[PDB]
Design a protein around this ligand. Structure first.
Ligand SMILES: Nc1ncnc2c1ncn2[C@@H]1O[C@H](COP(=O)(O)OP(=O)(O)OP(=O)(O)O)[C@@H](O)[C@H]1O
Ligand SMILES: [Mg+2]
Lengths: 240, 238, 144, 236, 232, 48, 228, 44, 87, 248, 239
């Protein structure tokens, strides 16, 4: 209290409380997980369908930053869309200034700086979304990164953001992600998402998969309907 | 509490209260409904008259030959947004010589309306937009909220007393795709009348319709033009 | 320490209103023209369920109040009470009654047995305008 | 609670800072002005200066242009700024268009300039009210710290406003302005209705048709005061 | 009148700019420094006592040169000192470019005082929480000035700022004579700092600079040790 | 809820048992209370 | 919540524009009627002093030769809006060689009004009644500080807006003539004015399709007045 | 032209040396001179 | 500790306190729970009671969703009106 | 309260920040100005006179703006410095434009206008400096002017500001003869009024600086009196006081 | 007293800038500790590597950043602010090299970073970056150099220093160390750094829980020791 209104104010114990408020705002969003397989990265996002009136795919939280980069936003949706636009612009500028696809580590760094720059001024508020950037290339392997509202970014082997981050992380650590290709990581991700989902509280939901890997030639694309149905069947078969 | 005065201040619960108040501003406007068939997108709005003899306020705005919107919220924000999308559609038609697809326009609307929700100085656009438009990917009924979050809705309703219309749309959603233009407009009129109180009824002087179809540009029907759609409507049970 | 005893009495009233030992068929009326100082426990809608708000009357309401309070007065039949109601924008019913009494007083000062419209206008100026604000006529020239 | 900013409307739609700006005028010395058939006269309550103070710098009647003059009431520095801006604008208008600035136009410019300082926060409104008299037809206008101008046959602003205007309405007759001397005597009487010292605290400026300004020396004003006293001596 | 201690552009009802006084208090809570002008030049001495041996004594120098003939020491906040040093050097270089002659000490002091004033005329900017003691030599005459966060500059013959500045001034007016020399000045300044120095004056704990006819030069630690031995 | 309670139990609504009259002074709260006491037909207790 | 034009309330209302309508409420009464024969437009003058020139009270202004306007509220904001309307009419004539439709004039004035907060000021506390003939016929429009505007068959603004509006609803029909519209406006003004109605407490204006000229009444006011 | 260029470069290098307390390098002088002259497109 | 009711908790409280009332099946209790943020259980019961009383005032036989919204407005003493600048 | 910002009008129409600056002027050192036939002088008290303060400017309170103009100073040190520099800039701009010295009064108005700006635009504290102006021109000859933090100015023949300004102005009112005052009489009057206003006795010369303005063969020489002549002025005042003691 | 601690430009009545002190307190919010030791012909930094998750890619968790081929840095405090200051320092080094031809000294790197921090401290536009930077570099004619830069804009050279939660204890241990004259060899410098960190943390220091950056006169290139080299140094320390 008092040290809490602006992101430019430091609390007496030394923390920016607006940033932490943004983090716990992200905490209230639906879970979204990302797992880098042996030869790629798979993003699995649960999406709470608030009203049946929404069409399928509306408010999709999978964003294609570049030809080879995908995002798995979680948190405020408008902030997520704005950050997606920022990441797309950064990738386009890198392509136009250097002539080749932006490395996902550098792209994550730049978008992390853009996020962090909004946690310094009293005129602007910290971004209310935390996202995942995933990519694959034949020269850099498979890479995954997570950016929080604070702007802190480092690579993860597999992670979750949203409501059940810890619950999904318990079921993520029990996978030997270094070995299997993403073809089976897809159904494993679907099973994890279906387990972490709370049917009695979040009512209905839709699971959206995306992947970027050698099986996809390196481009990040939404998982085709057949594989999505197979993964959903696998997840449903694990009811006991 | 003390975190309620600015859109730039995060609440300790993780909420932006000014954003929620901007959402609350939508229900201050009258109810409007939008719904799409496999071939047409139709949005019906209930117009409000401030005096017994003053004209009813325009509720459906014309944006482009293939895109038209209904407004529920601040008149100033609605007019400013309408001007912005008119300019965007004109620029798209000037550069690419192709009508702007509805999805890209709605994404631009969300991007534009998110700026006030993060940078201090300008309040969030306190208006909900029902965007009905036909493009090469079929008819579309988007809805845009003041929090700059846009939903691709099969059939939506926003404004005051619009929950009944939303329930009606949820119940009758399955029949919307395989409906002709007249059946779709009658379903929209029924959804609109669900919001009306018991004493009020949909007359030709307070209903505005907007239709954009396969071979039909976005046309707005008001007053007598509403009558062909109004006639033949089943009377509300009582 | 504060009041304590008054707070204890208020707490017992709270207990009687709602809680264990159901209150019964005891409908409770409470009035206060400063409600923001009340205890939230008392203001909770289990003790004071309905919160009826009395607001400054509109034009029609102020006309009705003027007619009510001028009913017994010995006034003219041509008094445009809508005019007087519009001449007191932000005024309570008590101020309307005071305006009527002041119009009668003006009609008594110069010993007329009928209170005319000019008396009511003078009363409105004496009651509302004479103590409303310091927005003088040169400062009131800012609006037209 | 709604009087600490200029852009905040009060719950009853009052711009309270704008209203407060008029108290600065209410604190100024009385300035009266009338218009006649061939003259425009304006007297000023010229309050006594200190013994060692030079009264040349203390000027309340300022000529905006050769065809229009102006007497203010309120803060002196704001008055200086407004007078300088009015002179510059009148010269610029004469530059752009050949015909000289009309008194109505210069009053419109002054009112707009005062208004544009009441529309923005972080900009204190001008605390002066002005009487602008000129020929195009003798015309008298009065501005306002709010930014509103008006056309008057006769005003008085400043300390004595209600009293001098009350004297003025039942004194400004057709025969009162029939003679130039009659109009100047009317101005002198109106100023004497408030300035209770006589002669020593009265400064009247008269502008005749197609003529120049002429500040009345404290001997012509003394003669007019003596004539007014002789005329009023008919009571006994 | 605590309600007027926050705004830098708001006069108190007693007509005092409280924030400038708070900046001056921050100055007075700084490291002790002395500056004394003798008939041969000026001497500026300061206490560069670190919090531990770990700090590199020679890393940062408190007494800094502005031109060949102008030096400048400080008391108050440290980081603001570097900004003021950079602005003073830039002003000296601009004056040299315009006039081809090294900037006079009085003119540099005036320009630096104006620079410090620029940070006291607006809200949202903090006054320079440091006071500058500037020595120079022009026209065969020593010059010593003190510039303040308020932008006020005077022409101190001999003064002390920082912690126990009252003690330094009290020690002065006793050991100070207008007909002294640069060596006597060095000795007097070292003694004045000793009146407010806690611990042994290690050659690395004290920084002394001399503004003489040949210009401004900061004393090497060997000379500081020699003077300390001659004093103690 | 006193003169005609049957209009409530039929709809299964328990009517509110308390009312707080609040507003600007002189708006008519005490006048309405006086009217209630005037035509209460039940036990009215004006607590001091 | 009621301190800036950029702060929303828990109910979603902007508690600053409503204050601008309140500022409107303490102006002066203005009645406007649109009939098939034209537009009539009456205002109570609210004279403050006999010395003050009545022609200085600009409650009625000429936006163009075909469209007139009536204000209510702050003089400064109203005159700014009136100048804006005149400038837009002249610009539209310059760029299109045609008379601007009163709907478009009101649109332009409203477009200026909506900018009370747009840049990274305050609402114009004044309602405007724009009467005038266009290619579709006579028309009457009303605009408020928020920039919302609407065509009104007969609208009352300023003080006494509620009572004048109620009486207008009582006495207005679709097929009124201009003379009877003037008579109704004058009787309503007399009934809603504290001062006795005569030639100096009110001003009248009217526009006709074929008689756009004489967009005012000068000493023929008494002709209608004593035939009340 | 050469006089003012050399004087400005000398002043900038004096500021640099004062900020570093070390002897300036010829590389720095050459670099600053070349960028300043290139910015003016050979007009100096 | 007894926390302020959650959105789902508020919907459940409204459902319990509407058990004895003739509530229409079309009422969306989730929408009401969204519309009554920072409402305690007593306030939700007051919402249900006010909705029933309003349905009595309307002269109806079953409670509607709009009646529940009007009761929500009544509980916090708000009085919704059609502002001119919204339309 | 309505004193937080310079642009906030009080309900009585008083700018409280401006009045605060005016009252704060009283903290500044006493500086006085007297007009007289063929002359006009300023005098000022050195205030802070500590023995360790070298006196190298000799004019810490008197400044020369133009060739035929000079100004005193009483207020904030930084505001005084910027105001004097800007006065010099305005005078030199006028001289460059018109090739004629600025006729005193205009210069005052110029600076005053700028001060008025700081009392109108937000985000700027009013210039808490009031200063006297002495000069000569081709229009009104020797002129003395008084300025205020509000930007208001006035012509004067004898006036003082700073510490004990009211007592000084009352003494000048009592002991000034309009028309028949010369430079010597003006200097004696300034010395005596400084002695009475300054609480310190005997009015030590090094605590007081006097600067005179006189026309000499069309050269409008502005002089600042050295300590030596102030010694003899103080001695003259002491001997007049001793002679006046003879009445007892 | 403590009512003046909401804007960084407001001086307290005691003349204290409380927001800068709060940034100093926020320095410890990272939860880690870094120690830098300057040897006779080398400089060494060792920082805590806390990876409290088997899912993190341990390669990217590094708190050691290479500002320039010869100038290395270790960051303490909030990770985002530290990375922002790292990129700012890299840009400043690149600008110095481009504008002056030769490589920027570590002296100037910390001086410029401190100047930026001070500018943020005096102008209430940006919140001060609560990240402490320690730069190591082989500056010719001066040997190894270790510098510390704080949110206040106070840069200082150090024979040995530390930052983080256990800053006072590590500085005290180093003060006990650098006082007994000893041959500060490269192995000795690494030994002193690791012993400082272990003594202040009482941790057995498995090789994956710490990160070591090394610069040496023999090779003036910022080198990050591999886990095998960390194990070799630890086993040499134990015996
Ligand atoms: N609507 C109304 N009609 C007629 N008279 C009214 C009305 N409202 C108020 N009054 C008058 O107001 C007078 C005093 O008001 P009342 O006693 O109700 O005050 P209150 O608002 O309850 O104030 P308090 O804060 O002292 O409790 C009554 O005697 C009555 O004549
Ligand atoms: Mg009562």
């Amino acid at each position: 209290t008092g040290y809490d209104l602006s992101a430019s104010t430091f609390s007496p114990d030394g923390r920016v409380f607006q940033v932490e408020y943004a983090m716990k705002a992200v905490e209230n969003s639906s879970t979204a997980i990302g797992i880098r397989c042996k030869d790629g990265v798979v993003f699995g996002v649960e999406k709470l369908v608030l009203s049946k009136l929404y069409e399928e795919g509306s408010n999709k939280r999978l964003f294609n930053v570049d030809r080879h980069v995908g995002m798995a936003v979680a948190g405020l949706l408008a902030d997520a869309r704005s950050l997606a636009d920022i990441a797309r612009e950064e990738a386009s500028n890198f392509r136009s200034n250097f002539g080749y696809n932006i490395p996902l580590k550098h792209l994550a760094d730049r978008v992390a700086m853009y996020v962090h720059a909004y946690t310094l001024y009293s005129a602007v508020r910290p971004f209310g979304c935390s996202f995942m950037l995933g990519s694959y290339s034949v020269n850099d392997g498979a890479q995954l990164y997570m950016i929080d509202p604070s702007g802190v970014s480092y690579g993860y082997w597999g992670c979750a953001i949203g409501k059940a981050r810890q619950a999904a992380k318990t079921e993520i650590e029990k996978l030997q992600m270094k070995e299997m290709t993403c073809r089976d990581i897809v159904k494993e991700v679907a099973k994890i998402i279906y387990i972490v989902h709370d049917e009695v509280k979040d009512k209905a939901f839709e699971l959206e998969l995306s992947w970027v890997g050698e099986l996809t030639n390196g481009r990040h694309e939404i998982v085709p309907k057949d594989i999505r149905e197979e993964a959903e069947k696998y997840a449903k078969e694990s009811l006991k | 509490n003390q975190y309620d005065n600015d859109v730039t201040v995060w609440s300790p619960q993780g909420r932006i209260h000014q954003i929620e108040y901007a959402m609350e501003a939508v229900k201050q406007g009258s109810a409007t409904v939008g719904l799409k068939s496999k071939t047409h997108a139709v949005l019906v709005a209930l117009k409000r008259a401030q005096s017994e003899l003053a004209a009813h306020q325009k509720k459906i705005l014309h944006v482009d030959n293939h895109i038209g919107i209904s407004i529920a919220g601040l008149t100033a924000d609605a007019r400013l947004l309408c001007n912005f999308m008119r300019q965007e559609c004109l620029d798209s038609r000037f550069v690419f010589d192709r009508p702007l697809p509805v999805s890209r326009l709605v994404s631009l609307i969300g991007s534009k309306t998110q700026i006030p929700t993060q940078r201090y100085g300008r309040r969030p656009y306190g208006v909900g937009l029902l965007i009905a438009g036909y493009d090469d990917m079929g008819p579309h009924i988007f809805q845009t909220c003041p929090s700059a979050n846009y939903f691709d809705c099969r059939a939506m309703s926003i404004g005051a007393r619009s929950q009944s219309a939303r329930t009606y749309l949820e119940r009758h959603m399955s029949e919307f795709m395989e409906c002709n233009l007249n059946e779709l407009v009658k379903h929209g009129l029924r959804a609109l009348r669900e919001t009306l109180p018991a004493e009020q009824d949909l007359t030709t002087k307070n209903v505005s319709i907007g239709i954009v179809g396969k071979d039909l540009e976005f046309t707005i029907y008001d007053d007598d033009d509403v009558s062909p759609f109004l006639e033949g409507l089943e009377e509300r049970p009582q | 320490g504060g009041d304590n005893e008054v707070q204890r009495t208020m707490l017992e009233l709270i207990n009687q209103l709602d809680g264990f030992d159901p209150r019964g068929n005891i409908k409770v009326l409470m009035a206060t023209n400063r409600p923001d100082t009340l205890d939230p426990a008392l203001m909770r809608p289990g003790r004071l369920d309905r919160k009826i708000e009395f607001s400054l009357p509109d034009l029609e309401g102020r006309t009705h109040i003027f007619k009510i309070h001028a009913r017994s007065m010995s006034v003219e039949r041509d008094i445009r009470f809508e005019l007087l109601a519009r001449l007191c924008p932000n005024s309570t019913g008590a101020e309307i009654r005071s305006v009527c009494t002041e119009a009668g007083m003006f009609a008594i000062r110069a010993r007329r047995k009928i209170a005319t419209e000019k008396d009511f206008l003078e009363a409105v100026n004496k009651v509302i305008k004479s103590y409303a604000k310091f927005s003088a006529t040169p400062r009131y020239m800012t609006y037209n | 609670s709604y009087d600490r900013a200029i852009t905040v409307f009060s719950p009853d739609g009052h711009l309270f800072q704008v209203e407060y700006a008029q108290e600065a005028v209410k604190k100024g010395s009385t300035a009266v002005g009338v218009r006649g058939r061939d003259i425009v006269v304006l007297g000023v309550e010229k309050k006594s200066v200190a013994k060692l103070q030079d009264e040349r710098t203390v000027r309340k009647i300022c000529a905006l242009d050769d065809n229009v003059c102006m007497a203010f009431a309120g803060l002196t520095a704001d008055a200086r700024i407004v007078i300088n801006r009015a002179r510059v604008e009148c010269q610029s208008h004469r530059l752009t268009v050949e015909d000289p600035v009309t008194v109505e136009y210069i009053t419109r410019y002054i009112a707009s300039l005062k208004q544009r300082y009441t529309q923005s926060n972080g900009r204190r409104p001008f605390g002066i009210s002005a009487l602008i008299v000129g020929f195009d037809t003798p015309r008298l206008y009065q501005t306002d710290p709010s930014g509103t101008y008006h056309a008057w046959k006769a005003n008085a602003i400043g300390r004595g406003a209600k009293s001098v205007r009350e004297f003025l309405e039942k004194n400004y007759t057709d025969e009162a302005i029939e003679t130039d001397d009659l109009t100047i005597k009317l101005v002198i009487k109106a100023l004497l209705e408030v300035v209770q010292s006589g002669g020593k605290n009265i400064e009247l400026a008269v502008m005749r048709r197609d003529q120049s300004l002429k500040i009345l020396n404290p001997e012509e004003i003394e003669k007019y005061v003596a004539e007014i006293e002789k005329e009023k001596e008919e009571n006994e | 009148e605590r309600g007027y201690s926050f705004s830098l552009t708001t006069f108190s009802p007693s007509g005092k700019l409280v924030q400038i006084e708070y900046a001056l208090a921050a100055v007075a809570g700084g490291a002790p420094s002395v500056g004394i002008k003798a008939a041969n030049g000026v001497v500026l001495a300061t206490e560069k006592k670190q919090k531990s041996i770990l700090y590199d004594e020679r890393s940062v120098h408190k007494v800094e040169p502005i031109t060949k003939h102008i030096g400048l020491v400080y008391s108050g906040m440290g980081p603001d000192y570097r900004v003021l040093v950079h602005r003073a050097r830039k002003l000296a270089q601009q004056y040299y470019l315009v006039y081809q002659e090294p900037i006079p000490t009085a003119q540099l002091v005036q320009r630096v005082a104006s620079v410090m004033q620029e940070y006291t005329q607006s809200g949202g900017v903090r006054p320079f929480g440091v006071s500058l003691l500037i020595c120079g030599w022009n026209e065969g005459r020593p010059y010593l000035f003190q510039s303040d966060p308020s932008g006020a500059y005077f022409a101190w013959k001999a003064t002390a700022m920082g912690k126990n500045y009252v003690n330094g001034k009290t020690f002065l007016e006793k050991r100070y004579n207008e007909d002294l020399e640069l060596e006597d000045a060095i000795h007097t300044a070292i003694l004045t700092l000793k009146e407010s120095f806690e611990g042994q004056m290690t050659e690395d704990n004290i920084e002394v600079g001399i503004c003489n006819e040949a210009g401004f030069r900061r004393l090497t630690p060997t000379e500081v040790k020699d003077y300390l031995a001659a004093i103690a | 809820p006193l003169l005609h309670p049957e209009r409530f139990v039929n709809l299964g609504i328990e009517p509110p048992k308390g009312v707080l009259l609040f507003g600007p002074p002189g708006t008519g709260k005490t006048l309405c209370a006086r009217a209630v006491a005037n035509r209460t037909d039940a036990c009215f207790i004006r607590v001091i | 919540y009621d301190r800036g034009v950029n702060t929303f309330s828990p109910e979603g209302r902007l508690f600053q524009v409503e204050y601008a309508i309140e500022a409107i409420k303490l102006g002066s009464t203005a009645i406007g009627i649109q009939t098939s024969e034209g537009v009539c437009l009456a205002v109570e003058k609210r004279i403050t002093s006999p010395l003050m020139e009545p022609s200085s009270i600009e409650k009625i202004v000429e936006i163009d030769a075909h469209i007139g306007c009536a204000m209510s509220g702050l003089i400064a904001d109203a005159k700014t809006l009136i100048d804006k309307a005149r400038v837009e009419t002249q610009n539209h004539w310059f760029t299109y060689n045609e008379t601007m439709t009163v709907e478009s004039v009101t649109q332009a004035v409203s477009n200026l009004a909506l900018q009370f907060g747009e840049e990274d000021s305050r609402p114009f506390g004044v309602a405007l009644l724009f009467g005038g003939v266009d290619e579709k016929g006579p028309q009457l429009f009303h605009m408020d500080p928020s920039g919302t505007f609407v065509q009104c068959d007969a609208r009352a603004i300023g003080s006494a807006s509620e009572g004048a509006q109620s009486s207008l609803q009582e006495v207005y029909h679709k097929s009124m003539t201009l003379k009877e519209a003037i008579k109704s406006s004058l009787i309503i003004l007399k009934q809603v004015m504290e001062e006795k109605l005569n030639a100096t407490n009110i001003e009248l204006a009217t526009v006709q399709p074929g008689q756009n000229f004489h967009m005012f009444t000068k000493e023929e006011l008494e002709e209608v007045i004593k035939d009340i | 032209d050469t006089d003012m260029t050399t004087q400005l470069i000398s002043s900038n290098l004096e500021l640099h040396s004062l900020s570093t307390g070390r002897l300036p390098r010829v590389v720095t002088a050459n670099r600053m001179l070349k960028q300043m002259l290139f910015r003016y497109q050979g007009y100096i | 500790e007894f926390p302020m009711p959650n959105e789902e908790a508020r919907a459940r409280i409204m459902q319990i306190h509407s058990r004895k009332m003739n509530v229409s099946p079309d009422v969306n209790y989730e929408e009401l729970a969204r519309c009554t943020d920072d409402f305690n259980g007593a306030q939700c019961k007051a919402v249900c009671v006010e909705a029933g009383m309003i349905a009595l005032r309307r002269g109806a036989t079953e409670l509607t969703h709009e009646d529940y919204m009007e009761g929500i407005l009544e509980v916090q003493a708000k009085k919704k009106a059609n502002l001119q600048y919204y339309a | 309260r309505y004193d937080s910002r310079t642009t906030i009008f009080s309900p009585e129409g008083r700018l409280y920040q401006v009045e605060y600056a005016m009252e704060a002027i009283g903290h500044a050192g006493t500086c006085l100005g007297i007009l007289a036939n063929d002359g006009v002088l300023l005098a000022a008290e050195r205030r802070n006179i500590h023995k360790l303060l070298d006196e190298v400017f000799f004019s810490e309170k008197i400044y020369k703006l133009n060739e035929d103009m000079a100004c005193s100073v009483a207020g904030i040190t930084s505001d005084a410095n910027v105001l004097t520099n800007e006065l010099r800039l305005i005078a030199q701009r006028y001289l460059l434009q018109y090739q004629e010295p600025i006729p005193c009064e205009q210069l005052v108005t110029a600076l005053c206008d700028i001060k008025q700006a700081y009392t109108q635009f937000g985000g700027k504290r009013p210039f808490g400096v009031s200063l006297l102006y002495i000069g000569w021109d081709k229009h009104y000859g020797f002129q003395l002017y008084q300025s205020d933090p509000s930007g208001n100015y006035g012509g004067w023949k004898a006036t003082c500001i700073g510490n004990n300004s009211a007592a000084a102005v009352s003494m000048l009112k009592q002991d000034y003869k309009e028309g028949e005052m010369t430079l010597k009489s003006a200097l004696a009057l300034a010395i005596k009024v400084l002695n009475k206003t300054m609480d310190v006795s005997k009015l030590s010369a090094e605590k007081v600086e006097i600067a005179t303005l006189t026309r000499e063969n069309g050269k409008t020489v502005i002089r600042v009196l050295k300590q030596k002549e102030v010694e003899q002025l103080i001695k003259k005042h002491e001997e007049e006081e001793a002679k006046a003691e003879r009445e007892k | 007293s403590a009512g003046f601690d909401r804007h960084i430009t407001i001086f307290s009545p005691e003349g204290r800038l409380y927001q800068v002190e709060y940034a100093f307190k926020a320095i410890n919010q990272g939860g880690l500790t870094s120690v830098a030791v300057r040897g006779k012909d080398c400089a060494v930094i060792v920082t805590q590597k806390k990876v409290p998750d088997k899912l993190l890619d341990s390669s990217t968790v590094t708190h050691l950043f290479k500002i320039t081929e010869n100038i290395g840095c270790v960051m303490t405090g909030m990770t985002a602010d530290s990375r922002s200051q790292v990129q700012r320092a890299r840009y400043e080094a690149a600008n110095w090299k481009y504008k002056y031809g030769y490589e920027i000294p570590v002296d100037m790197l910390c001086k410029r970073i401190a100047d930026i921090s001070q500018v943020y401290t005096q102008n209430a536009e940006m919140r001060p970056l609560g990240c402490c930077m320690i730069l190591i570099g082989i500056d010719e004619e001066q040997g190894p150099q270790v510098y510390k830069c704080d949110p206040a804009g106070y840069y200082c050279g150090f024979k040995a220093t530390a930052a983080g939660v256990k800053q006072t204890e590590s500085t005290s241990f180093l003060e006990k160390k650098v006082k007994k004259k000893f041959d500060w060899t490269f192995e000795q410098t690494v030994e002193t750094a690791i012993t400082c960190l272990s003594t202040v943390l009482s941790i057995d220091f498995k090789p994956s829980e710490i990160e070591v950056g090394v610069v040496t006169v023999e090779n003036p290139k910022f080198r990050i020791l591999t886990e095998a080299e960390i194990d070799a140094h630890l086993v040499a320390l134990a015996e």
